[PDB]
Design a protein around this ligand. Structure first.
Ligand SMILES: Nc1ncnc2c1ncn2[C@@H]1O[C@H](COP(=O)(O)OP(=O)(O)OP(=O)(O)O)[C@@H](O)[C@H]1O
Ligand SMILES: O=c1[nH]c(=O)c2nc[nH]c2[nH]1
Ligand SMILES: [Ca+2]
Ligand SMILES: [Zn+2]
Lengths: 96, 362, 184, 145, 48
């Protein structure tokens, strides 16, 4: 069971995105869809880099989005994270 | 003359290529017959002859003829493989290298990792004159020249590909041509590209199936020297059958986990050996007569060997072979020692190795 | 960043292509540094946000202890995790990793032999085959077979293939010898 | 036929006792669990015979002094002198031992083939007892399941 | 719609081509990417 749990963790990693949680197949409809989504669109380390960038940046120079994320971060509101949605899904009819 | 010899050679090569599988089958049949004959084998009385006993009498000539026939058909099977499957492997390799050279320039722009032995071996074929011999596109060098000439050096990439500058313009244009005559042999010897067949035999040797067939060769030729080397040919049925190959590959499947588990089994048994060697040594006398004690835990190597062998394959642990501890002040400590041995070594890590292998098969 | 944002938000207008294929090089240089995420906007839509990722920070991320911590956290949250608690554990790990990378910058102040032996055996054992075939006895063999002889005729290539196999054996022996040399 | 032979010999009536295994559903399931994986089962026992035959060949070539099986030394049983007998002793007694052939074969201490015999028998225990026997058992029980 | 020659169909039905097809079919199904599937198929087509 321990080995199978490790395999299931790896399997879920390879079949669903960490943040949005959308299945890999939905992106993989186009070639390299899941790779693109998990490397550029919804990269895990990108949120860490963005949080660090917000911490280093002065609050006076914050943009609207940056100030929004900063405010709800110090309010401990994680709704800014996508939940079962992405840019492709949001503008799918407009994009393609 | 030469026309006739080439025609007969090619006809017979096609014969072997066509009959590769039937001979592959009859070779296994002869391997079975040889083992069945060997099954009725004696030793005679220091005079020790390995004598073949026969109720009939004529088995020994039959075994000799069967061994000779097995070796002949085995050589013919290697010829059949070389004339049947080798061109496909050469075509695959020569297409892969061509596409890597054209699309990516793996031998022009970015050199191989130096750890890809196939890459370093294909470094030799990129300058061979007789390139795509098997591949259909005999202009891959002409295309890579146009693609990467102006940036990476016209002449430098040309001499990397081993292509002459003279033929380029008058290949499209009008020029002289050179016919060939079969009897003329200097031209044939020059056209035989030492570097190309150099590389080709390299590829064939690196191929796994040719290695298997050459091992089969070797086992047969050693079977002539000693009749018992024909028993290794008996495993070829395990290579022929699908589920037998599944069983054989079930071991290599979980190779890393299996090796680490047997290593842990060795480590735990070594700790037990250390404990026994330090404290529990009086109990390890293994002599039926008390006059000459065997005393097999006096040396650590011997005691570890006795915990590796006999200890692990006991079914109840080391305490079965080790003498009873009743009436001793280390009675409880030895009980704990051996009970933990039975649980950790016999019940556990052995069922684990077995489970790894059987689960890989499943 | 402005060009990438325009390209993403307008993916069909052909006129912006001219600028894009005129400015591969700037975009290619800034590609590692540009950071891309998606968030729940104030208008309840997905918005792509672009920021600057410093190379020193990326190296701190690529340092081994941060990698090990990331692996451990990824295993933990996937094995046990609640939908609400997932996004909280992720941000706690983010803060811990930020501290870890800050500490890493402070602390860090400013097979081949086996391959080569096999290649040498492959080179100068098939070179041995070439040397023993370089005798060029084809004319002498044609003197021998002055009229057709099927037996003399087949024995030639039979011996040739037998020698090819014996060269394979010599190669296997040479590889074993080289491996023994490497190990001891 | 079994009944009419039971008249001649009263003991032929014991074969009629298996008819309950034909009547009951789960008993038929157990009986058919053997025929279910018939091909794989036959090939596995064939491989078990082959591996044991290789072990017999090795023992017959080298490890023969260790195969004396006589309580009194005056008349050695010497049961690996003939290959058929030694293969029969590796088929029977060897496989159904619980620890391998080394249980019945005498101890190798004090011999220059000590390490070689250790490897021989340990590999026998792993490949023949731990493996292919659990495999046959697993095939049958998994077919039943 | 195109023309399939009978000689080519016999070459397809020859045993070694069948064995190669079986091996390739097992390989791509056991390991295969959605993009890499269609590439391995065409490579196998050229080899066949
Ligand atoms: N939000 C996500 N961010 C990054 N990778 C993700 C995400 N969701 C799923 N993945 C998948 O996880 C893998 C990359 O992250 P992960 O750390 O699990 O693997 P990796 O390739 O070993 O990573 P690393 O870059 O640390 O070596 C890819 O297979 C990717 O498709
Ligand atoms: O033009 C060609 N393209 C190919 O793919 C091919 N394969 C064999 N022969 C071929 N010719
Ligand atoms: Ca401001
Ligand atoms: Zn996502």
């Amino acid at each position: 069971e321990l080995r199978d749990q490790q395999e299931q963790v790896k399997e879920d990693m390879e079949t669903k995105c960490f943040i949005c949680g959308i299945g890999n197949d939905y992106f993989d409809t186009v070639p390299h869809g899941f790779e693109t989504h998990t490397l550029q669109e919804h990269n895990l380390a990108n949120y860490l880099f963005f949080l660090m960038y917000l911490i280093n940046k002065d609050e006076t120079e914050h943009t609207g989005q940056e100030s929004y994320v900063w405010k709800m971060y110090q309010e401990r509101c994680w709704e800014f994270f996508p939940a079962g949605d992405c840019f492709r899904k949001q503008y799918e009819d407009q994009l393609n | 003359f030469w026309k006739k010899i080439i025609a007969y050679q090619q006809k017979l090569l096609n014969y072997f290529a066509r009959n590769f599988y039937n001979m592959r089958m009859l070779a296994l049949f002869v391997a079975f017959a040889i083992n069945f004959i060997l099954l009725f084998y004696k030793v005679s009385t220091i005079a020790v002859h390995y004598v073949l006993e026969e109720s009939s009498g004529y088995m020994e000539p039959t075994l000799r003829i069967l061994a000779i026939l097995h070796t002949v058909i085995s050589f013919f099977c290697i010829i059949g493989y070389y004339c049947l499957k080798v061109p496909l492997v050469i075509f695959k390799r020569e297409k892969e290298v061509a596409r890597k050279l054209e699309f990516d320039g793996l031998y022009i722009t970015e050199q191989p990792s130096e750890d890809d032995i196939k890459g370093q071996w294909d470094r030799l074929v990129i300058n061979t004159q007789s390139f795509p011999n098997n591949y259909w596109d005999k202009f891959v060098k002409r295309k890579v020249m146009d693609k990467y000439g102006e940036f990476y050096g016209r002449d430098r990439i040309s001499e990397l590909l081993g292509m002459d500058k003279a033929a380029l313009d008058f290949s499209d244009a009008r020029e002289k041509k050179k016919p060939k005559k079969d009897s003329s042999l200097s031209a044939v010897l020059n056209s035989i590209d030492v570097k190309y067949q150099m590389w080709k035999l390299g590829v064939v040797f690196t191929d796994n199936s040719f290695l298997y067939l050459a091992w089969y060769m070797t086992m047969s030729v050693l079977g002539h020297y000693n009749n018992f080397f024909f028993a290794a040919h008996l495993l070829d049925i395990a290579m022929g059958f699908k589920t037998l190959r599944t069983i054989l590959s079930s071991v290599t499947h979980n190779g890393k986990q299996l090796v680490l588990t047997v290593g842990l089994l060795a480590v735990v048994v070594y700790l037990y050996t250390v404990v026994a060697f330090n404290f529990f040594r009086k109990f390890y006398n293994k002599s039926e007569d008390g006059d000459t004690p065997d005393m097999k835990c006096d040396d650590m190597l011997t005691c570890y060997m006795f915990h590796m062998y006999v200890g692990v394959r006991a079914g109840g642990g080391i305490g079965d072979e080790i003498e009873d501890p009743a009436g001793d002040e280390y009675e409880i400590y030895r009980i704990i020692f051996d009970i933990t041995f039975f649980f950790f070594v016999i019940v556990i890590l052995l069922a684990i190795i077995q489970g790894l292998i059987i689960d890989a098969f499943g | 960043v402005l060009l990438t944002n325009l390209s993403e938000h307008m993916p069909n207008d052909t006129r912006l292509q001219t600028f894009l294929e005129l400015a591969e090089s700037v975009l290619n240089y800034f590609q590692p540094f540009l950071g891309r995420i998606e968030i729940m906007g104030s208008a309840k839509r997905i918005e792509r946000v672009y920021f600057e990722i410093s190379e020193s920070s990326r190296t701190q991320w690529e340092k081994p202890q941060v990698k090990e911590s990331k692996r451990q956290f990824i295993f933990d949250v996937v094995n046990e995790g609640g939908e609400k608690e997932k996004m909280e554990l992720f941000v706690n790990f983010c803060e811990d990793t930020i501290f870890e990378m800050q500490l890493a910058a402070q602390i860090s102040e400013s097979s081949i032999l086996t391959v080569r032996s096999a290649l040498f055996a492959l080179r100068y054992n098939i070179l041995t085959l070439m040397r023993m075939l370089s005798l060029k006895s084809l004319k002498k063999q044609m003197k021998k077979v002055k009229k057709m002889t099927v037996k003399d005729m087949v024995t030639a290539f039979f011996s040739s293939y037998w020698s090819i196999f014996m060269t394979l054996l010599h190669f296997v022996a040479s590889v074993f010898r080289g491996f023994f040399r490497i190990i001891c």
